């Protein structure tokens, strides 16, 4: 690496660091060094903030490239095959802890994708086929929701008895929730209405509103019951912590 006397250490997204030389090199560019996964990457830049491109080659000949954004707000770490073009892996990390980590296949096509939100919640995609479809999972605090993915959107599903709950997330991040019950008895059959404006799903049974399921901006779900006659909410909303609790809300 570089000498403390000869360089400034700068922190970066994803717990990374880069050493920027104090002086410009013989070409009038600052030197850049960063060790990533035991491999030292090198680059130079006309600027001295730590932004630029660094590169290195693994023992297996794979080319590694790290791009540090101009304001140090993002890093892109790519590992290519020895041809330096076919992607093997790619991870973009933001200063806010969010990131997108993509695994590619033998032909350089993303086969898997992991999207980490700043709050730590994840959206994991695998078995990604050529037509944009694949398997999906949403990793939340306390529980995991599972579903599928298609070019249009991701759909996580939760079933309990004859009731199926589906949470849709489009590419734009738009969320919508819906519920369907195959129950025949009109006295026990669940029905629901979605209010996008408030991100809440109101369940009804036997002509009475029973519960409001709120899907928060903080990627949590809360439940609150309506009074005995089903007209107004009672008490306070309680946050879901376990998958079983969602199912209990669907019973």
């Amino acid at each position, epitope marked *: 690496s570089l000498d403390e006397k000869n360089s*400034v250490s700068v*922190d970066l997204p994803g717990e990374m660091k880069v050493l920027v030389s*104090k*002086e410009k090199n013989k070409d009038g560019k600052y030197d850049l060094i960063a060790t990533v996964d035991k491999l030292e990457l090198k680059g130079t830049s006309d*600027k001295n*903030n730590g932004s630029g491109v660094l590169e290195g080659v693994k023992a297996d000949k794979c080319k590694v490239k790290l791009t540090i954004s101009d*304001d*140090l707000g993002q890093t892109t770490l790519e590992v290519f095959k020895e041809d330096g073009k076919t992607l093997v892996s790619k991870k973009v990390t933001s*200063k806010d802890k969010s990131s997108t980590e993509e695994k590619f296949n033998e032909k350089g096509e993303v086969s898997e994708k992991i999207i980490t939100r700043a709050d730590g919640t994840r959206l994991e995609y695998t078995g990604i086929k050529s037509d944009g479809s694949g398997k999906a999972k949403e990793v939340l605090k306390g529980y995991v929701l599972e579903g599928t993915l298609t070019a249009e959107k991701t759909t996580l599903v939760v079933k309990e008895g004859t009731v199926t709950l589906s949470k849709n997330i489009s590419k734009s991040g738009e969320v919508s929730v819906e519920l369907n019950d195959t129950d025949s008895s009109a006295a026990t059959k669940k029905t629901a209405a979605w209010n996008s404006g408030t991100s809440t799903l109101t369940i009804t049974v036997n002509s009475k509103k029973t519960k409001d399921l709120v899907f928060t901006k903080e990627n949590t779900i809360t439940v609150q019951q309506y009074d005995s006659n089903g007209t107004k909410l009672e008490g306070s909303a309680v946050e879901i912590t376990k998958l079983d609790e969602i199912k209990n809300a669907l019973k």
Partner: antibody
Amino acid sequence: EVQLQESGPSLVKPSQTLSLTCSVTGEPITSGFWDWIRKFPGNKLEFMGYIRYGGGTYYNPSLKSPISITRDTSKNHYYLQLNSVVTEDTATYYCARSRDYYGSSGFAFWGEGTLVTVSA
Amino acid sequence: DIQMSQSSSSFSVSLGDRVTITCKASEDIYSRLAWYQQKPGNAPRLLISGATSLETWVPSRFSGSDSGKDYTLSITSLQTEDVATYFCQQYWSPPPTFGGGTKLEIKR
């Protein structure tokens, strides 16, 4: 893109406390450095302090009077407080975001600034 | 505190003429210097970072130099829109400190 706007009284008496607010829009204050800089009547600039990730702060040790910086991530507002001001605290106060998200850099985005006079 | 010194408080320049503004640090700051342009009734605007790296809004006539005894901000051809006060500032070591400002007046 971020927008910064300072708010506070134009007149505060010596011995009293000066409180200012910086209302930021277009970006959350949860990332980056959010500073307070003042411009003295003789056209002299002075860095006062900043608040950053997790509410961590730093204050210019050379300041005549001690200050404190806090934030409300819910409101996306951060504040400046200076107790027992003196006439020498008369200046135009500016809030600004540092250029880069890590390390030491300049002040890229500034508010319009508010003139605060400290006088009896 | 590192003292940043701009020995000239103000200059008067002719339209289209070359201008050079000087900035000195009390100690070595290794080009971790910023420059700002401030026009009356407006907040300072970051113009240069790293002593020579221009920001994207800046016209090509502006430049900064490292290769001298101290630091400078140069304008090859002064335009009417350049009449302003320029401030240098170091961010090498805390706390960041500013130069006193150099005001420009255009002749007519």
